[PDB]
Design a protein around this ligand. Structure first.
Ligand SMILES: [Cl-]
Ligand SMILES: [Cl-]
Ligand SMILES: [Cl-]
Ligand SMILES: [Cl-]
Ligand SMILES: [Ir+4]
Ligand SMILES: [Ir+4]
Ligand SMILES: [Ir+4]
Ligand SMILES: [Ir+4]
Lengths: 173, 173, 173, 173
């Protein structure tokens, strides 16, 4: 058992394990989003790349949380990863709306865990979230909001044309 | 005559000669497609480049088959190359639909010859098709499907605009 | 829907989706194994690295399968990922025994899918597994067998000493 | 006197001076540990290096605290440095146990001062500890826990052999 654990509450340890599950589920959702945009009948490579990069970013967030759990002397506990909420993700607009819903839920989970750390007087936990998660999340939600606005400007009455141009002229290929 | 031929059926030898003719005919079809898109009254350079590169790829497939026919001790026999099925190829969409029809027919000819090789217990033939043709063909049909989807998204009610943008922003110039 | 699908059975499409789930579950199992060996009360960094690298390899196998599913015009369908079978993995020997059990099950799933592809006369599927999975799996099982033998030689009556030496002198740090 | 001091409580100023004394005492303890492992009748160079590097790290922590005390307009006050608690440090295991006791006491002193800064609404102090001390301390305690586990695995019934191997194969020389 641990000879290192100090100032690390069972409540934080459990919440950190829950947050790992949320990040892994987010990674899985993005894996599904990316491959949907790779379908021959969807074929938006920039959209595929955007979600594939987010699947890797969320897996890395989960790994940083697991590394921290061991650094503090907590014990990683894994649960089932629920499959993503959809099998098909509709338009780039539908997908970007689903992504910002998902990120808002992750952000609230970070803010909840920060509040628990503050209540528990766990400044290492609070610093860890501030340093590696809170600003990364604000920057990503701002980028998704910027994308949603541009996608929405492009619908007009020529939705196909706008979806193509957004993928060609904003997203990376 | 051959002092090398071993495990190489007359049925495979004949089918390989037929497949050479199919690949050369495909190369000819792509030659015609490329020059149609170079016409001053069509003038889509990315479309011209796309089909010109496929004419070279199909000629190279035919040459690899002929090289293999000699490696096995079979005898190349050439037939007339039928002119392509059209003199004018319509829109980029019409052309890409004709290209995927053509590739599906080539792919079926590869799968038929693989099945004959398997029936004849000719693993060298089966490996040769797996190594140099079957995945090349799946990748090319996937690319053409991706293109068809993007071309179709771009028609809307402004067909000229979509045809220009597809050629400028997806195809190479 | 797909305009590319050719010679790709619904049975193979479903089995490919099952195999993706098996590879993702294997990746998750290895994620749990790696973090267990990073615990302050286990602290075997070479063992941690060995399983962490396998988590990445299994995720990459799943992604290659998903890429192929789209290349063939099949549709990715994701299921829940079952949590790994243990929360604590015992000794390096226990862990390596669990890993070879897991790899044998993956290998049998590859051989089953190859047999289905052969029955369905799907040479692209058969080639894909031969080219990217079957030899990778044989090489990995051979490496794990080599490790198991060395770990077993090192138990003697000084189990702690042998576990340390194996991690220091065979595994990478 | 100071023309810069702003939001810097006398309680924090005094506690910062106490923490400087704790860090300097820790540096002194590590100086004694390092030279003990350099004795001709102990002769564990990796253990000597490990503690000598920690003596320098703790002196640097004290200097950063003194720099910050002046940055805030507080006044450094030095007290006697108590000699270390032992003249001889026993085995590498005894020494590593004494080191983690010492680090746990330093960590608690950091957490206490963070709590005082939070009570005093002194965010600069709180940020300073989060940025330069709290994670450095968690990482060091995790490393010492990892070492303790490896040292403990190596005792078995051949304590001399395990002590040699730990110093040769884990610690730097
Ligand atoms: Cl479900
Ligand atoms: Cl004739
Ligand atoms: Cl369960
Ligand atoms: Cl005095
Ligand atoms: Ir992609
Ligand atoms: Ir041209
Ligand atoms: Ir690790
Ligand atoms: Ir020394």
């Amino acid at each position: 058992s641990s000879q290192i654990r100090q100032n690390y509450s069972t409540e934080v340890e459990a919440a950190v394990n829950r947050l790992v599950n949320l990040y892994l589920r987010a990674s899985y959702t993005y894996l599904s989003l990316g491959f949907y945009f790779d379908r021959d009948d969807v074929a938006l490579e920039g959209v595929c790349h955007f979600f594939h990069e987010l699947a890797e970013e969320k897996r890395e967030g989960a790994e940083r949380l697991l590394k921290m759990q061991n650094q503090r002397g907590g014990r990683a506990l894994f649960q089932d990863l629920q499959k993503p909420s959809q099998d098909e993700w509709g338009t780039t607009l539908d997908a970007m709306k689903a992504a910002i819903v998902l990120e808002k839920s992750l952000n609230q989970a970070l803010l909840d865990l920060h509040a628990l750390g503050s209540a528990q007087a766990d400044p290492h936990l609070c610093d860890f979230l501030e340093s590696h998660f809170l600003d990364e999340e604000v920057k990503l939600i701002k980028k998704m909001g910027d994308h949603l606005t541009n996608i929405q400007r492009l619908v007009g009455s020529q939705a196909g044309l706008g979806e193509y141009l957004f993928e060609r002229l904003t997203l990376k290929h």
